[PDB]
Design an enzyme around this catalytic site. Sequence first.
Site, PDB file in Angstrom:
ATOM      1  CD  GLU A  62      -3.203   0.499   2.160  1.00  0.00           C
ATOM      2  OE1 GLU A  62      -2.775  -0.062   3.190  1.00  0.00           O
ATOM      3  OE2 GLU A  62      -4.351   0.984   2.077  1.00  0.00           O
ATOM      4  CB  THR A 136       1.342  -5.939   3.061  1.00  0.00           C
ATOM      5  OG1 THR A 136       0.464  -5.479   2.027  1.00  0.00           O
ATOM      6  CG2 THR A 136       2.770  -5.567   2.685  1.00  0.00           C
ATOM      7  CD  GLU A 245      26.418 -14.268  23.762  1.00  0.00           C
ATOM      8  OE1 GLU A 245      25.966 -14.082  24.911  1.00  0.00           O
ATOM      9  OE2 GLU A 245      27.639 -14.259  23.500  1.00  0.00           O
TER      10      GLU A 245
HETATM   11  N1  LIG Z   1       0.745  -3.073  17.807  1.00  0.00           N
HETATM   12  C1  LIG Z   1       0.428  -2.487  16.658  1.00  0.00           C
HETATM   13  N2  LIG Z   1      -0.240  -3.202  15.688  1.00  0.00           N
HETATM   14  C2  LIG Z   1      -0.566  -2.615  14.515  1.00  0.00           C
HETATM   15  C3  LIG Z   1      -0.235  -1.295  14.275  1.00  0.00           C
HETATM   16  N3  LIG Z   1      -0.674  -0.972  13.043  1.00  0.00           N
HETATM   17  C4  LIG Z   1      -1.271  -2.056  12.502  1.00  0.00           C
HETATM   18  N4  LIG Z   1      -1.225  -3.077  13.410  1.00  0.00           N
HETATM   19  C5  LIG Z   1      -1.739  -4.443  13.222  1.00  0.00           C
HETATM   20  O1  LIG Z   1      -2.141  -4.609  11.883  1.00  0.00           O
HETATM   21  C6  LIG Z   1      -3.323  -5.372  11.791  1.00  0.00           C
HETATM   22  C7  LIG Z   1      -4.157  -4.871  10.618  1.00  0.00           C
HETATM   23  O2  LIG Z   1      -3.693  -5.399   9.393  1.00  0.00           O
HETATM   24  P1  LIG Z   1      -2.297  -4.912   8.760  1.00  0.00           P
HETATM   25  O3  LIG Z   1      -1.153  -5.731   9.303  1.00  0.00           O
HETATM   26  O4  LIG Z   1      -2.118  -3.453   9.094  1.00  0.00           O
HETATM   27  O5  LIG Z   1      -2.459  -5.084   7.170  1.00  0.00           O
HETATM   28  P2  LIG Z   1      -1.214  -4.835   6.185  1.00  0.00           P
HETATM   29  O6  LIG Z   1       0.094  -5.221   6.827  1.00  0.00           O
HETATM   30  O7  LIG Z   1      -1.201  -3.404   5.721  1.00  0.00           O
HETATM   31  O8  LIG Z   1      -1.528  -5.780   4.929  1.00  0.00           O
HETATM   32  P3  LIG Z   1      -2.375  -5.155   3.718  1.00  0.00           P
HETATM   33  O9  LIG Z   1      -3.530  -4.367   4.275  1.00  0.00           O
HETATM   34  O10 LIG Z   1      -2.881  -6.251   2.816  1.00  0.00           O
HETATM   35  O11 LIG Z   1      -1.483  -4.224   2.935  1.00  0.00           O
HETATM   36  C8  LIG Z   1      -4.035  -5.188  13.115  1.00  0.00           C
HETATM   37  O12 LIG Z   1      -4.536  -6.420  13.572  1.00  0.00           O
HETATM   38  C9  LIG Z   1      -2.974  -4.685  14.071  1.00  0.00           C
HETATM   39  O13 LIG Z   1      -2.703  -5.668  15.041  1.00  0.00           O
HETATM   40  C10 LIG Z   1       0.436  -0.571  15.243  1.00  0.00           C
HETATM   41  O14 LIG Z   1       0.733   0.603  15.035  1.00  0.00           O
HETATM   42  N5  LIG Z   1       0.768  -1.170  16.437  1.00  0.00           N
HETATM   43 MG   LIG Z   2      -2.304  -2.666   4.112  1.00  0.00          MG
END
Ligand SMILES: Nc1nc2c(ncn2[C@@H]2O[C@H](COP(=O)(O)OP(=O)(O)OP(=O)(O)O)[C@@H](O)[C@H]2O)c(=O)[nH]1
Ligand SMILES: [Mg+2]
Lengths: 430, 88, 427
Positions: A62, A136, A245
Amino acid sequence: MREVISIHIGQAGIQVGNACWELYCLEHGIQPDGQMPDAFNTFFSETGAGKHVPRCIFLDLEPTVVDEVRTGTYRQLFHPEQLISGKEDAANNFARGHYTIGKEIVDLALDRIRKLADNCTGLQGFLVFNAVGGGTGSGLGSLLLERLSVDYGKKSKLGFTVYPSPQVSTAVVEPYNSVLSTHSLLEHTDVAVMLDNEAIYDICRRSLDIERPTYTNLNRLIAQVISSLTASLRFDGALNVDITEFQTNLVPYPRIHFMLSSYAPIISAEKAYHEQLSVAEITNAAFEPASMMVKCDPRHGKYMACCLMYRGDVVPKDVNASVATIKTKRTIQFVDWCPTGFKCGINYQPPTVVPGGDLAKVQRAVCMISNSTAIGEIFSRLDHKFDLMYAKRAFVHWYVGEGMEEGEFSEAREDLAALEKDFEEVGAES
Amino acid sequence: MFRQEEQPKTGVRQFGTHTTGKVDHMLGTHATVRPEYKDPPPKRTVPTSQLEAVRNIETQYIKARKAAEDARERQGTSHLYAAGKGWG
Amino acid sequence: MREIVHIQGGQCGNQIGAKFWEVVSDEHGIDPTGTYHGDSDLQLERINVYFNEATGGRYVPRAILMDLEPGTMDSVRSGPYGQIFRPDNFVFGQTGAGNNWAKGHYTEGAELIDSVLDVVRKEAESCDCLQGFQVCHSLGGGTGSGMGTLLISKIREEYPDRMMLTFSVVPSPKVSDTVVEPYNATLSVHQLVENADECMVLDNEALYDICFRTLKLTTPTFGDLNHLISAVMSGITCCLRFPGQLNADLRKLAVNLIPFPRLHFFMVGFTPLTSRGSQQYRALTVPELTQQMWDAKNMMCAADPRHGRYLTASALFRGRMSTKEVDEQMLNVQNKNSSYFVEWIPNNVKSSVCDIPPKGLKMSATFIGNSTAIQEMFKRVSEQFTAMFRRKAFLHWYTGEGMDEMEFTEAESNMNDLVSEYQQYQD
Ligand SMILES: Nc1nc2c(ncn2[C@@H]2O[C@H](COP(=O)(O)OP(=O)(O)OP(=O)(O)O)[C@@H](O)[C@H]2O)c(=O)[nH]1
Ligand SMILES: [Mg+2]
Ligand SMILES: Nc1nc2c(ncn2[C@@H]2O[C@H](COP(=O)(O)OP(=O)(O)O)[C@@H](O)[C@H]2O)c(=O)[nH]1
C-alpha cells in the site's frame, strides 16, 4: 563488525519502525536530517562525511504509508530508494501477498538486501517486522522470508510479530491470514518474539495510567524492547549478549522458537517520584503476568527458558540476588529437565526516553524475553478461531481465485496442530 | 621510514571508571579495600546537630529529639563512676 | 630464567587477565606507559618471568589475548593498563562463539587456533626456558571454554614436558548466567582431565560471599571479583618472581599437590582479607593468617572443604616471618582436626616462604587445596547435565556443528569417573 539489518513489512511494520527509528536516532544523538552534531555502526552506516543512513528496508504494497514517511519529519534520514512502495495493497489477503502481487515487488526487495548486506562488513542478524493479521505483513513476509532463507543460510532472523488478541482484533480474516503465516515462520524464522495488541492495551491502561491511548503509544512502547534486545551490540556492559546468544540460550528445540517479552519499569512521569525502583523490585515486576506483551497467562504453563536483559546501573550481584528469590518463588515454575533456566545480560546505558513519550526516565530497566509452554494458548485460540470459520468455507473464494489452492489451508491447519502437540509434549514431566 | 597511518577508532561505546558496574574498590592496593569506601554504620543514626544546622530555629521536633538524647545521657550517667575518674 | 606465557580466553579470561596484569605490573612497578618507576632494586631481578624487555626501557607482558569477538579486545585496550600489551598479540575473531562449546571447538575456533598457535610459538621461542603456561578462562562459556580447551590440547602436543596452570570459573549451584552452562562445562572438564597439568577451580559465587560476608563490601562487581582472583594469581608464582627462604617454583607445587595424575583439580584462597572497618582491630601475625587460611568461607571454590578430607594442601607465604612458627601452625592444623586430613599421607601440608610481601601488605599467603570435597562441585554440574541431556534439550546447536551425541556420553562418563575416584579416596 557487529551490525544488523532491519526489515519492516506491512502497515504495522512501517509504524513500528517509525517509532523504532525515532528512538535509535535519539540514543546516538543523530538528528532527523541525518547529520550527527563508534557505536552507531550496528544501525547507521557512515556515508561520506557527516551523514548516516539507517540499515532498514521499508516495503509495503500500500503506497499510503511509505509516502507518509517520505513526506514526514524523517524525509532526510532515509535513502529515497531504500523505501519501497507499491501500486496496490494485498488487502488482508495472504494469496495476493504470496502469489498475485507479492511476487512482482519481492524482486526489488531482495535487490536492496544485496546492497545493504554488501555494505555491511559482518552481518550478524536480520530483524523482520510484520503483523500476520494483514495481507502485506503475512503474505509478503512469508515470501520474503522464503527467499532470505535460501540465500542466507545459518544467519539469525529475529521476528517481532503481532498475533490477534482473543478479544480485541480488527480484521475479520485475521485467523485466515495468521494460520497460513505459521506455515512459513516456524521453518524459516530462527527466533520469533510474539506480541499482542490487547496485552499492550492493558499495559498502557494500568502501568502508564493513560486512559485513551492509540497505536502510536504501542509502537513507542514496543520499540523499547527492540532497543533493549540489541543494546549489547551498541553499548558496552558487564555481560554482553549478542544476537547469536539469544538464538542458542532460549530455544531447546528447532521448532519451538516462540518467546514472550516484558519490560520491568513501566512508570509514568507522575508516578516515578513516588515509586522506588530496585533491581529486586523490578525483577519481581518483570515476572508479573499482567506485564506480559501477549495475553497468555504464564501460570497455566511452565517457563522453558528466560533471558533477562538489563540496562542502566545494575550491579552484577543484584541480578543474581534477584534471581535467587525468583527461583524460590512457587508461582513461577520451570520445566523439570532445565535446572539452569536464566540468561543474564547487563548493559550500561539507561534507556533513552523520547520527548513527548509517556514513559518516564528510569535509572534501571529489565527486558525479559522468555520461552514458555503457555504460548500454546495463543496458538490454540487462533486454532479454534480458524476451524470454526473454515468449517463451512467462508472467506475462501477470495483466497482460491488469487492463485492459492484450497489444499494450502489443510496443510496449514495440520502444521498448526503439530505445534499444539509439540508444546504439550515438551512440557511433560518425566 | 614508511607511511604513518593511524587506525580508525572503531569500538563499542566504552564507559568511564565512575560507573557502578566497573567501579573497583581494590585498585592498585593488592586485595585491600580502598579508603573512602568505609563500612556502613549501623542504623545511620543522624545527630541533632545536623538537623539544627539546617532548621532556622530549634523547633519542637529538635527540642524533643534533644530531650530524648538528654534522657539517653541521663540513663548512661552512673553517679558513682566519673568519666575517666574513679569512685567519688 | 624461568618464564610463564599467559593466555586469556573469552570474556572471562580477558577481564580477569586485564586485572591480573594490573596487579602484577604494579607489583613489579610497571606504570601504564610501560617503563619502570619503582623504588625497589629487587623487582628487576626476575622480570623476564612475566615480561619481555623492549626498546626504550619498555616492558611488554608475555600475554596472548584470544577470543572470538572484538568486543572484549576494545574493553581491555581502552581500560587502564591496557596500552602495555602488543597489538600483535590481540588475536580475535569476528563471528563470535555465542556461548556454544561446539562453535568454539570445531567450526569457528579452528580457523583461529592456527592464528593463535603462531603467536604461542613466537612467545615461547623468544624466551629461554619455559617454566610453563598459565591460562585463565571460564567453563560455562563457549568463547573461552571450547576454544581455550582446544588450545590446551594443541599446546600439550607441541610442548609435552612443560607445566600448565589453568584458572577456570565454573557454573554455580546457587545462581546461573547462561542456560547452556552444564553442556559447556562437562565437555570442558572432559578436555581438561587429560591435558591440564594442574587446574585451579574458581566459582563466582564463592567470590561473592567472600566479598560480602568477609570483606563487608556493600556493592561488589566483576571488577572486585577479578581483583580477588588476580591476588591469588600473584601468590602462586611468588617464589619465582622474588627470592625466599624456601623457594618453590610451579613444579614444586605440582609434585606435592598431585598424588595421582587425574586428581589435579584444586581450590585456592587468599589469607589477609579484612574490611576497612577491621584494619585497625586486626593484629597481623601468622597465627591470625592461618585461622583465615583454613577457614571454609575464605575458600574461593563453592565446595565446602569440611565435607571432604584434604588429600594435600599447600600455602604460599609471603613476607618476613619465622619458619618454625609457620611450621608449628601446620603441625597444629593437622593435629587439632586430624579427621579432616588423609591418614595415609603424613605431613599433608607443604609450606613455602617468599621474602618479599605484596605491595601495601606486611604479610600475605596463598593457599592451594586439593580436597576430596571437590566432587560435590562436579556432581552438581553432572546433576544438571544428566537432566538436560535426557530430554536432549539445547542439543541441536551442538550436533549441528559436527559433534554428534557420542562425545556427550563420553564426557558424562569421565565426569562420573572423576567423582568416583575422588569419592573412594575419601574412604
Ligand atoms: N501493535 C500495533 N499493531 C498494529 C499497528 N498498526 C497495525 N497493526 C496491526 O495490523 C493489523 C491490521 O492489518 P495490517 O497488518 O495493518 O495489514 P497490512 O500489513 O497493511 O496488509 P495489507 O492491508 O494487505 O497491505 C491489526 O490487527 C494490528 O494488530 C500498530 O501501530 N501497532
Ligand atoms: Mg495494508
Ligand atoms: N570473574 C569474572 N567472571 C566473569 C566475568 N564475566 C563473566 N564471568 C563469568 O563467565 C560466565 C559466563 O561466561 P561467558 O561470558 O559466556 O564467557 P565467554 O563465552 O568466554 O565470553 C559466568 O558464569 C560469569 O560468572 C568477569 O568479569 N569476571
